[PDB]
From a paper:
The two gel-forming mucins [name] and MUC5B constitute the main structural components of the mucus protecting the underlying epithelia in the respiratory system. The VWD assemblies are formed by the VWD domain, C8, trypsin inhibitor like (TIL) and E domains, except the VWD’ domain that only has the TIL and E domains. We determined the cryoEM structures of the wild type D3 assembly of the human [name] mucin and the structural single nucleotide polymorphisms ([name]) variants [name] and Arg1201Trp that affect intermolecular interactions. The D3 assembly forms covalent dimers that can appear in two alternative conformations, open and closed, where the closed conformation dimers interact through an arginine-rich loop in the TIL3 domain to form tetramers.
The rs36189285 [name] corresponds to [name], while rs878913005 corresponds to Arg1201Trp, both substituting the for [name] typical arginines. The [name] mutation, located in [name] β9, is placed directly in the interface between the [name] and the TIL3 domain. The substitution results in a slight reduction of the distance between the two domains. No interactions involving this residue are observed in the WT or in [name], but considering the resolution limitations a hydrogen bond between Arg996 or Gln996 and a TIL3 β1-β2 loop residue cannot be completely ruled out. Only when 2D templates from WT open conformation were used for particle picking, these could be detected in the [name] sample. The ratio in [name] dataset, 98:2, illustrates the important reduction in open conformation particles from 17% in the WT to only 2%. The open conformation was not detected in the D’[name] Arg99Gln cryoEM preparation during standard particle picking. Only template picking based on the WT open structure revealed a few particles. This observation, together with the described reduction of the distance between [name] and TIL3 domains, suggests that this mutation stabilizes the closed conformation and reduces the steric repulsion between Arg996 and TIL3. The mutation [name], frequent in Asian population, affects the distance and the dynamics between the TIL3 domain and the [name], directly interfering in the conformational change and oligomerization.
Residue numbers in the entry:
A (entry chain A), B (entry chain B): 899 to 1229
Amino acid sequence: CLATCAVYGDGHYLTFDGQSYSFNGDCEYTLVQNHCGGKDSTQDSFRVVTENVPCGTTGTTCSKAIKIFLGGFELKLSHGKVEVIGTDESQEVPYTIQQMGIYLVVDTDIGLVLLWDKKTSIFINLSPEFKGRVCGLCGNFDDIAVNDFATRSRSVVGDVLEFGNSWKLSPSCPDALAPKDPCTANPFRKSWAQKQCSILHGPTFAACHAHVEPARYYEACVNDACACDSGGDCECFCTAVAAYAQACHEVGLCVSWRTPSICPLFCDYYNPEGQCEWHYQPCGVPCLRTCRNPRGDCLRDVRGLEGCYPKCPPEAPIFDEDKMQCVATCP
Amino acid sequence: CLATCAVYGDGHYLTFDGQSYSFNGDCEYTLVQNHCGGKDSTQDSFRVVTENVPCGTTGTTCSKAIKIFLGGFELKLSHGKVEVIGTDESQEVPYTIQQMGIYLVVDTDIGLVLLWDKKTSIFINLSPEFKGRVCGLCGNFDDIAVNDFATRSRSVVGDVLEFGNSWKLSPSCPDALAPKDPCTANPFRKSWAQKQCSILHGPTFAACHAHVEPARYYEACVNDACACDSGGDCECFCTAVAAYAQACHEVGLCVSWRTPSICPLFCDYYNPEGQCEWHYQPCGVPCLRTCRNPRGDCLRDVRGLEGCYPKCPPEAPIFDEDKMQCVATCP
Ligand SMILES: [Ca+2]
Ligand SMILES: [Ca+2]
């Protein structure tokens, strides 16, 4: 299969091999890099970087915008939209923008796909052909967890703070420091945080409990809820729960955890007047007939997307994907 | 028409005549009382009381449960459910429980109807025949705003704190004090609070701006968002916005303010598998054919309810109102 590097919440990271760590810093860092040391192995260089800003009062940092550089093309992901800056007249545009469920998906011919929740999280999937050829925060794709702490010089350092700060992009940006305990800083929020995050240990995720241990995700939920004290704590809780749900869906199990009282969705909003063709799919539709993807072609490469999806009627089965309405014929 | 006494948020009150004031207290208080001084004017006594608990750290108090006493019948409204305690074998049950939209509606033959949002708010509508015969926090229904501060002894006192504390139900409960400024107490939340509550001054409520001045509601939204720092600030903001929306709907204007990113609803959750018969009605359906209310009878006495409503198909047009599904025939 394809390994996944996941970044979400307040500095929560998961390497391709499987190593997990927490690191926060008000700077710009590189997640995945190509051709480390300038070794152009007959492949175009691709680089993914992230920008972190201090959110909250404890000192935690959360991702704000993501910049993608590949083949001379620069893309900006901020405020829930895509902005193109670096344009190359020659060659051909290698990225395709597609909105599926609640995630923004970008596909590249080189084999790199990214999933964006448009608020804080980001998921990276890499083709197996790039094994042992990438460097960055996600670590080398050598399937070895212990040696994922290379500090930009092919040297493993046990200090997670030093490893994280070695990949900073701005030389003038300040060095990171050891974070404090958000729950200790804000004791009065601990009860509400525990009550909200107890759903992870509830019967809803009983099936996924055996496959994936939720202790780390539960701790992340508690810490984020404790720290998300600057407004919109519901967003922090929903992002943590959605990250755990996506992790569960990656294995293959499907869980329908969303309720009208817990992180609700408004699929009916997109429904046109007098018609109802939108529903919430927890597993997600495998393949949908669109103008860009006809009925014959499905392209079910990525699985694990959730959100509102249009259920076109037997008449006009193909979805426009541009006007947000079922169309009889795609031009 | 019928005057409305509205209680919502952190001690926000609106008298029947129109007087507005703010008062918070960790005690039990009587909203509307009947037969003041024991004057049984050939009418059964009805009494509505509320219980307030300290929510947050600033010191603000919000309603938790509501108890209704009338004709020897006692009802409890807590945890989003109705519990019956006082049961009278003789006579007949005078209250009917009906769930419409997002509000819980109780109807009485005497002419008293209450709307409950199940979280913090409560709306009281009184028949004009009870003019000048009721006492309590809502004040006498004499259509005079200046003399609404009777301190349980037919004496008007300019001290709002004294007027509020004169109606306490527990003699041993402590006296209330002057509240502080939540935004001053929590300065870092002011920017987010203002950004969220700025929707009131936006173009969405332009039509209602002329009829109703939103300055008081804007201040209430800002104060509640500043004080709602113990978790679930989104609930506080949504309750304030919904209170303003109900106030707008009382005049007659209809506003569709809910968006998937601002206080969303999950009407699709109640939809059975393979069927879609639920939609969000901002104005609210005037009358719906139910088992208790057939097609011939509409009973459009109360207007201004919003939430998810079932749109039954031409087949099985009457709604069950008990099994949450359209039924062909009501037994
Ligand atoms: Ca490694
Ligand atoms: Ca009066």
